[model samples]
Target chain A: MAALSVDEYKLSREKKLLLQLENAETLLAPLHDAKRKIEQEAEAHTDRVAWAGFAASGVQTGLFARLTWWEYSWDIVEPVTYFATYSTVAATFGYYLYTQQSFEYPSARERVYTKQFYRRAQKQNFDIEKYNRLVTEVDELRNQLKRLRDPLE
Target chain B: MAALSVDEYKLSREKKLLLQLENAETLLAPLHDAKRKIEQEAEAHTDRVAWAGFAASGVQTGLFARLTWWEYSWDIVEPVTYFATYSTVAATFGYYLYTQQSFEYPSARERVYTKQFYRRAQKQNFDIEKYNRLVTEVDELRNQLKRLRDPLE
Candidate 1:
């Protein structure tokens, strides 16, 4: 006699959802790469100025020009400043998109498998509703204990 | 008029502890200010480089070393990069110290008041043991509910 197995049946819905999740990650790769480039631009910009600023410090300039430490320092500071500001703003947007696209949507799709498994078990006499009722009872009992310790009233 | 007010007696212990909490904030202010300055240093450094890099761009250079956009850009980028790197490291340390000094200690001190109050109440016929027993009951119920939801056996 052949052994019965639930895995023998095709899980097309779960398979399709998992594939979509993989495709979503593939789509987001380019966007992440672009974000990375901006950081590099800032890094390269900062490196350039540090060398120039020190080298140019205290050099003679024309009548309209100044040649102090401040002048030299500003050269190095500018690009990094722009980068820092851009990083703060760009990172905020990037994080929001990453959370929504890469994290939340993928997790939502993944939960379907667990939900399906739970419902399948329900058909085999699992009492989820009774479990939920017991949870409410437990929470109520906990609240009562808290009130006993700290009577706000 | 039947009974006199219990409010006339000064709660010296409570009063002393409350003053201590208030005084703790005064001492913490300087430390908070110092941490804040580190962040400002990082910000100012970035800003200085940004302005310098832009202003220094397109300036005249010697005949053998003709100035170009890339040269100017590199000059700006270098210093800012240095500043950016320093800012990241310094700010991380600053935040760690700030969190420990400003937040953790104050909360630890504040908990004493709650502990004192609870103990005082405990002395005044509050049965903590009875409440603890109720808590155990609640926790057991919660465990049973969880087991129902995710049965291993």
Candidate 2:
């Protein structure tokens, strides 16, 4: 196959990226709400554990004032560790998905055009002539949008 | 100034890229609408002109049978040229923006932690004591997220 010219490659790459962006966002839509719910629940759990730790430590202090710093640390380690571990799990899951804006599905530049083209343009039903005509119209619009602002282009 | 550590630089780059992505998308919002409007309008305008051209040429052909192909081409030149020029202007404006994907916006493995820290941990009015306490919560989350899925981290 012949290599594509730079202009062709740029247009092809942009189209591919737009489609990938749409696909990823679609896959992530449900996950976005799930992640948010988990994050909130995890934080609430951590807060409860922290409060329990504080109360436990206060009771422990009353029972033993002469305890060293290391001993005091050990006393609260359970709740602290639990909070830390749970929060980490919640956040790591969030990080994996939400890092890309795709965690919630969002439309891309070519999404409407792509969908319309497939739904209307290629269908045997309806006015196929109008559909064919609209292909040129959409192409013209796409080309207009893609023209370089720079004079050289 | 002293150099930032690798982790510090990575965090800083992620924040900046995220900001740039936001800014770009914000600027593009209105332009996206405008571009779509113009594209649809241009197609409608072209249709109207093409209809007019067809009618005018039909009248001319009835009036003169000997007129060459070039003369007929000239009759439609007005609409063709108008469509071409108008489309170029619309596309050139589109090109000036909508170039970046925010898609290329780099992921911060720890983005969720960063966002949580800003939202809950550093606020002035809401329970500064709890906020202070949650600093460790946010930090631990950040560290866990930063530990990459692969061992190289």
Candidate 3:
């Protein structure tokens, strides 16, 4: 019932897979659980880099009403930029050389909405702290988890 | 209009945020979109490394999901060993020792399901060469995605 370290557990996972491939029925169920967890994470959150894109970001903004039941657990922020003008000609969120290239706020005071709710500020704050604390914590966890499964490393 | 490279788009996003912090209002819509994408991905995929550990191979084993994901992504596979047992007497996966560390996989079989799938004798007969070719097509599509935003890069 002890927790496994990352390295120890990974080696075991691969071994189980190899053995199962070799007809080791004994390694089936646990291997399945591990694989499923990996797939779930990879499909959903593997690319923090894509967060700031226009289409993905736009869909995200509707979350206050759209994904209200959703909870955030990861640690990156996405950003977008929009511009537009208001007149008798009609109005849009923001104007850009290309429509999708820009970001638009719902109102002139949209920063209030962003500042009131977004998590980027927190991430930025972490950067302001020099990101050392979080880095240390991750390092400690890595050691602890590895030691759990393979202390030799 | 014209598409921005995903990387360029992301940087533009941050720049837009900088503008927001500077009290500009035009980019709020894009900001909202980016923020939403970030939150969605974060919550859905919070523990990739921990889970990857559960399925790692080579040297490192029995670590958390977080670190395992990193090593795998970074292509740093190593050789590892674990003192492992079967589920002959239990309803779960196996328990193993790696480098004198004790760890347990509650369901090892399914956790390593893809490996199991690959190891099957029937899989040996499968047209993996053709599948590999199909994989190249997918890679091409991914290249298209990158090129759409970064024509020069």
Candidate 4:
């Protein structure tokens, strides 16, 4: 089949009108929420909320691992691809098999337990580092996925 | 590859520990975000905030369409599968052809010129109904393609 031109791919008739309206709505829907996120992050950073500590303790790593897992909702597929894809699982497992006598599941399971300590802390009281890692992971994942999806199309 | 028994699968000394840490972190990250979204949505509903009119004038339909389109990240094996997969493209074309006159490019192109009322609205703020219709169509196309691709998979 001959490749169609861009003009051909552009939304037809009523679609173009519909798209224009949809564009405005999309821009306005999250005004308050986006503002809230920015405010929270600025506050966390300005107050020296100890972001690196959780990160350094492998808490951040575990949180990142987990955050990546859950961001797989509609329009949010990049996190799954980047940090938790089958390829990543294979790579992590392959890394283990090269150096270790046992298979990879044990270590994967172990992180699940260690991650619990931070999870409890997170639940009982807010931990800036944990929150920060999670927020950052999800936002980055969302943005990356947006670029991948290109809603304008 | 050996199919390890469920009991044997539980024998990981290190991988279990690793997974424990990972899982804990995973759970923590989403737990925090869900809390916030619930909090905000609860506030919105309880405060009786004007929700940009979600139920009126096909608003919900339009939003659904936009949201679905927003989900098609190009990383998937058949990225457009979320909307109009290749399998259903023909059917989608057929629908459009029926709506117009024929799938013949020259004939379909005529609709672009004659469907002027729809074009006039393109500059307006938003039209949810039209957007929703497009989304509905795309989804229909995707379903058709899936059936064609995997008749008995």
* Per-residue C-alpha lDDT of model 4 across residues A68-120, encoded as one tens digit per residue: 65655433334333322222223322221222222223333444445643322
Error of 2 at A68 (Å): 99
Q: How close is candidate 3 to the true structure, as a TM-score?
A: 0.13
Q: Model 2 over residues B1-153: C-alpha lDDT tens digits?
A: 476453434435556556445445433334344433434323433342353344234344433432443433323223223333333333332321232222122243574465432222111222322322233232223222222311331
Report the Cα lDDT for residue A52, model 3. 32
List the candidates ranked by lDDT, beginning with the highest: 1, 2, 4, 3
| Cα-based lDDT for every prediction | 0.35, 0.33, 0.29, 0.33
Worst 10 residues of 1 chain B by lDDT: B118-127
Ranked by TM-score from best down, the candidates are: 1, 2, 4, 3
Every model's DockQ: 0.06, 0.01, 0.01, 0.01
Root-mean-square deviation of each candidate, in angstroms? 22.6, 37.1, 34.1, 34.9
Better of 1 and 3 by lDDT: 1
Per-residue lDDT of model 1, residues B103-122, tens digit only: 22222343443553312211
Winner of 1 and 3 under DockQ: 1
Residue-level error in angstroms, candidate 2, position B118: 36
Off by over 4 Å in 2: A1-153, B1-9, B12-23, B29-48, B61-153
lDDT of 3 by residue, A1-153 (tens): 566755566653563354234333322344444433433333333232243343434534543542453343322223221201111111111121111111122123524434524312112111112222223222222222322332221
TM-scores of the models, in the order given = 0.21, 0.17, 0.13, 0.14
Per-residue C-alpha lDDT of model 2 across residues A133-153, encoded as one tens digit per residue: 323333333332343333444
Kindly report which residue pairs in candidate 2 clash with one another: A144-B91, A145-B91
